[PDB]
């Protein structure tokens, strides 16, 4: 009688960055989504497509949990159909997304005095990302037409930028641990039922 | 690859790296100003030099993109704030020469002391002990040596340094395609690339001079009333038709006439409304002052303070070994970190200061969505004009009756209102000829209208003619009397105090028409009015993204500064001033001197 380990995802001591998000494949278990919505600790709980009214009767195939940390002003960019540095260059959700976006303020966990620079976000890219596309490459981004030759100088920028997470920051500039549950309902055995 | 996109890509890298690094500069500066120790000075200077070297590296990178090839108006205002070269346009020897002069002038001023000629062992610095003489003493001879000794033992030392300061600051001005250093300082009000909102650097002279000619009827009746009352406090020392001596103006420089108010009170039997004792009986503390301060901004329509405001600000003196700069400063640290640092006491002055400093915060909270180079006021006088109208509405007896600091049966007295209006006019109308003449002298010195052998000749000829203030002792060309001011010896533009005063009552008269205030302007209170705070938030949320001529029209409906709102504020006093001065002479002649 195995159950789906949401404590490994939500209560993890180390979270990934948004440019390289940690997707976990959760299958062949029993899930309890009523405990997730009735926890009263999540600052953002927005389910798209599937209603958030405790649907514990639908059998899903895989529950992909994308774990990353962004700032509080960029949580609105994890909605389907948004624009910004996170929705275009870091983490893109499709316009036919069927899942939930859980995000809570983690200023007690991911902020240090002097700054917590362990979380990176991609500031520049040549084009926008596809939905559910991860780009971990760190090549030098040329703004125009002059070559960079592997070193960033005038008009050449390193595409990754570091979040500065401090506990004295405002609520908009504060680390939010975002867990994006993705549900794939297709012609499949649909192991994750969770009665 | 157009340069519009290459500068837009540059600013996205710049704005996030500047906001990350200036926040570390601001947090290190906060840790100094509340926790003064030997480690915090070094950590402020280390994290301040990283910001001061990053900003000069990317300023040279911003000049790669030509400003004439940028089409978007948002990018041009950020690039012009970043391509503005300063001392970097000079050579390596001259830039080191300029900062040697600026550091020497700032240390001669701060560590300079004037000695008493009667007792030579009493040599007093300006801020601890020499400002105490010029703001509290009522003796002619005691204020004479403190005034003369400050401009002889200190201002003479700044004269050979200010002459080379003029030549070096004119050299970097003409290397940045400016006429002089005064034209460089007038570029803070210069607005370009606008359709009808363009403001030239020559238009600032034509607006400050034109607005000042309308304060002359108000200032002359104030000058005549001060002179008629100073000739009672100082008998046989001021002629009834002449100018005022410079050491009898309630200040070291005659900047504010506020300290002369005990010598000139219109109704001595009617005391001013001072609610510092009603807070003690109601058991108010430092937190209650700021909670009542933010209730004023909630009632006007502005949002509440942040959650991190109350836990991170220093709203009281800590009562420990931590040395604290107790000057009231509202801190915009960046990344939505807003703080107020003041050693608040339970008084009425700190009650109005808490409204003034929180009005700085509500301005800082409004342009937080702007880009980092546009997170400031519309000009250098817009930011303190917003804070000053909050202290105007809070000090009214109508507001002090609603919050319980006055009895419900408090009947307003017109005799107490003339006492309030005269005390306001000694601070506000008394500083406008001083602020005009100090910048008028300094603009002509940089331009070349005033030669170096006519510096103190044209300094006192202008002060008699404009301010109506005569020097008590003759000063030759070895003196430097404007350099005795803080903003002159420390390289600051002083026209920020003139224009803020014009905007202060222009904003106040604009918001009190949407508040439906029936009565005179000085009795207005914009509290419990969500239309006078929504209108103010339209200008507040712009920041520096728009020209200040555009930002002025969004509240007051006029692009240029107007002093007729300022004359409407003191119009009940101006009627009383003309009746009081009917047996005196209004005006002054420049022929009379105390020597
Ligand atoms: Zn202020």
Numbering used by the authors:
A (entry chain B): 333 to 527
B (entry chain A): 19 to 613
Q: Could you share sentences copied from the article?
A:
The interaction of the spike (S) protein of SARS-CoV-2 and the angiotensin-converting enzyme 2 (ACE2) receptor protein determines viral entry into host cells and host tropism. Mutations in the S protein, especially in the receptor-binding domain (RBD), can affect the adaptation of SARS-CoV-2 in the host by changing ACE2 binding or binding of neutralizing antibodies. Here, we examined binding of the mink angiotensin-converting enzyme 2 (ACE2) receptor to mink-derived and important human-originating variants, and we demonstrated that most of the RBD variants increased the binding affinities to mink ACE2 (mkACE2). Furthermore, the cryo-electron microscopy (cryo-EM) structures of mkACE2 with RBD-Y453F or RBD-F486L provided a molecular basis for the Y453F and F486L mutations enhancing the binding forces in the interaction interface.
We finally obtained the 2.3-Å AmkACE2 crystal structure, 2.9-Å AmkACE2-RBD F486L complex cryo-EM structure, and 2.85-Å AmkACE2-RBD Y453F complex cryo-EM structure. Interestingly, a comparison between unbound AmkACE2 and its bound RBD F486L or RBD Y453F showed that the overall folds of AmkACE2 from AmkACE2 and AmkACE2-RBD F486L were very similar, with an RMSD of 0.520 Å (for 577 Cα atoms), while those from AmkACE2-RBD Y453F showed limited change, with an RMSD of 1.573 Å (for 594 Cα atoms). Although most of the residues in AmkACE2 that are involved in binding to RBD F486L and RBD Y453F are the same, the number of van der Waals interactions between AmkACE2 and RBD F486L is much greater than that between AmkACE2 and RBD Y453F (322 versus 157), suggesting a moderate conformational change caused by the Y453F or F486L mutation in RBD. In addition, AmkACE2 formed 7 and 4 hydrogen bond interactions with RBD F486L and RBD Y453F, respectively. The hydrogen bonds between AmkACE2 and RBD F486L included AmkACE2 residue K31 interacting with RBD F490, E38 with Y449, Y41 with T500, Q42 with Y449 and Q498, Y83 with Y489, and R393 with Y505. Moreover, AmkACE2 E30 was involved in forming the salt bridge with RBD K417 in both structures. Furthermore, a π-π stacking interaction between AmkACE2 H354 and RBD Y505 also contributed to the AmkACE2-RBD interaction in both structures. For the F486L mutation, AmkACE2 H79-T82-Y83 formed a hydrophilic groove, which clashed with the hydrophobic RBD F486 or L486 side chain. Compared with F486, the smaller L486 side chain showed less clash with AmkACE2, thus leading to a novel hydrogen bond between AmkACE2 Y83 and RBD Y489 in the AmkACE2-RBD F486L structure. Therefore, RBD F486L exhibited enhanced binding affinity to mkACE2s, and RBD F486I also had a similarly strong binding ability due to the similar I486 side chain with L486.
